[PDB]
Amino acid sequence: PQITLWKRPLVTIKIGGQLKEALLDTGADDTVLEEMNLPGRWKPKMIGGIGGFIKVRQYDQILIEICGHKAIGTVLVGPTPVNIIGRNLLTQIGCTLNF
Amino acid sequence: PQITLWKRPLVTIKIGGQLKEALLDTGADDTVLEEMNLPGRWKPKMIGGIGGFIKVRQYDQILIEICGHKAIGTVLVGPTPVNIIGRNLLTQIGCTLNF
Amino acid sequence: XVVXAX
Numbered sequence A, B: 001p002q003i004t005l006w007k008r009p010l011v012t013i014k015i016g017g018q019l020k021e022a023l024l025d026t027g028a029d030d031t032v033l034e035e036m037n038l039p040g041r042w043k044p045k046m047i048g049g050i051g052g053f054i055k056v057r058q059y060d061q062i063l064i065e066i067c068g069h070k071a072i073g074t075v076l077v078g079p080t081p082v083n084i085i086g087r088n089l090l091t092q093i094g095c096t097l098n099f
Numbered sequence C: 001x002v003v004x005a006x
């Protein structure tokens, strides 16, 4: 797709039989979700943003489908106000910024 | 141009006659820049993100050049760790996500 | 409004 930015670039994602939605986020190094369904044990990670720094839960090798495109990579679970797909996964689906 | 996302999408901008660099962020509703002086009257605004809220000064109808592309709109100024161009100005340069 | 992650 070619997605304009007049609204939030929210897309359908699927992880483990669960349909969610997340924001295609070029300003995020990482993919951060508020919750994942029963994802098991995780690694502690610190990330930062405009307001400060937060503790997140790192899960590696997650099978995720983004707007129909299959990707494998790291998903963080953390107190993000919106579910975000970061560059770690955006590159995997061949996503670019164009103007 | 076409910008891949293997690294942060930082680009050259020009604002208040000064060359700066800023992160093209599809996950930012608004444009937030580091401390600088801008013309006109500002209003107090708060913006959210990862790590909490920050206090910014809102300047309206500001001219910004993003990779030589002219855009007029709202620029927030405050204690951001990185200059961020949000959707409010990305739309003004016809920036799209493509995959 | 949010402005998303270092």
Ligand SMILES: O=C(O)CCc1c[nH]c2ccccc12
Pocket: B043, B044, B045, B046, B055, B056, B057
């Ligand atoms: O005094 C200043 O320099 C700006 C104060 C300021 C900006 N955004 C704000 C939001 C709420 C309260 C105060 C502010």
